[PDB]
Design a protein around this ligand. Structure first.
Ligand SMILES: Nc1ncnc2c1ncn2[C@@H]1O[C@H](COP(=O)(O)OP(=O)(O)O)[C@@H](O)[C@H]1O
Ligand SMILES: [Mg+2]
Length: 353
């Protein structure tokens, strides 16, 4: 319901010594599910606080649709005036207030009569399917119900934008699938623009249609999840977005040499970083007569693992310590020599520092 325009936004702390956000540019579309992925300290929370209006850019500007809301250290439209709902990592329900009371809290100063408050609370409660537990205290609620109450609370003032800062922390994994699914359902039910930030790539593929990767204050790449996955701008982005084998090698006329392996790609540097995802590796004791797979050389199985019903096979090239792992339905025992194949169009390559 609202477009978020971030133009050259920077944010400094410690009187300038720390640059938490550096020249961030991004246009989030109205009604879009947008995600930001980045390691601890990347500046995710700082970013979300600026969007919320709890902080302002040191330099640069922020627009909601065509409305300027903050500019170069100045707050133009305060948080209470932005039509935003928030669930932050530190979020907590007031333990001594019922579910009703928690959801109603934000309406305290909204000039609504008792009946208008009740109606609004019950309406959102129904949407989140917790109308029947409105009289419960948070301790009487399941983990799933607690999140539903927090969401209802964030949505009670009918916002155009919902902000989630690493919300799926209190959950495990069965609960994580459900919580993610709930976020998407609610976004569809209301049409809100959605921004979720996390250090967990699972949260991103699960919820966001477009994602920005944040590293040390810099937004290094923006695109659809699959675009970041297949065409990462760096080896660091490549591994942040998913599992990958990282290999260092020498660039030569034949390609990037790594022990007994030779990758048919190149960079304009002395050495290169090779990135190859597990699904893009295939091991075989015989030559594979299949054009979609490319032989890179001989390898040797170093160790095998088992998890999630699959075997994790780790090899090294001959005359190298570099590791390459991949998953398979069948095991190959350690010490065995094998042929290593890769999906050539899937080899990722970067100049080395
Ligand atoms: N109010 C603060 N005072 C000083 N430094 C801060 C403050 N808030 C954030 N920072 C610093 O800015 C950087 C980014 O912080 P943050 O946005 O919280 O990262 P993230 O949420 O991605 O883990 C960190 O180095 C952090 O220490
Ligand atoms: Mg944070």
């Amino acid at each position: 319901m609202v477009r978020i325009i971030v133009k050259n936004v920077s944010k400094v702390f410690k009187k300038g010594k720390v640059v938490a956000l550096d020249n961030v540019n991004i246009n989030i579309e109205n009604g879009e599910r947008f995600g930001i992925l980045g390691p601890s300290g990347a500046g995710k929370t700082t970013f979300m606080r600026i969007i919320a209006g709890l902080d302002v850019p040191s330099t640069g500007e922020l627009y909601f649709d065509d409305r300027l809301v903050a500019s170069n250290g100045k707050l133009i439209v305060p948080p209470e005036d932005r039509k935003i709902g928030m669930v932050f990592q530190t979020w907590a329900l007031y333990p001594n207030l019922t579910a009703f009371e928690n959801i109603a809290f934000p309406l305290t100063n909204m000039k609504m009569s008792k009946e208008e408050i009740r109606k609004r609370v019950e309406e959102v409660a129904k949407i989140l399917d917790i109308h029947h537990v409105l009289n419960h205290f948070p301790r009487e609620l399941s983990g799933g119900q607690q999140q539903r109450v927090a969401l209802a609370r964030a949505l009670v003032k009918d916002p155009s934008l919902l902000l989630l800062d690493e919300p799926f922390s209190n959950l495990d994994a069965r609960m994580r699938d459900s919580a993610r699914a709930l976020v998407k359902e609610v976004q569809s039910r209301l049409g809100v623009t959605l921004l979720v930030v996390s250090h967990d790539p699972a949260d991103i593929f699960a919820i966001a249609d477009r994602v920005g990767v944040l590293v040390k204050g810099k937004l290094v790449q923006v695109g659809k999840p699959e675009d970041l996955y297949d065409n990462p701008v760096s080896i660091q982005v490549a591994s942040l977005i998913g599992e990958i084998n990282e290999l260092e090698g020498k660039v030569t006329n034949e390609g990037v040499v790594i022990g007994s392996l030779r990758f048919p790609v190149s960079v304009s540097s002395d050495r290169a970083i090779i990135g190859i995802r597990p699904e893009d590796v295939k091991l075989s004791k015989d030559v594979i007569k299949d054009d979609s797979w490319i032989l890179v050389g001989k390898g040797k199985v170093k160790v095998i693992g088992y998890q999630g019903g699959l075997f994790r096979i780790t090899i090294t090239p001959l005359d190298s310590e570099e590791e390459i792992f991949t998953y398979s339905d069948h095991p190959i025992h350690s010490g065995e020599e094998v042929l290593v194949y890769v999906r050539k169009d899937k080899i990722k390559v970067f100049e080395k520092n």
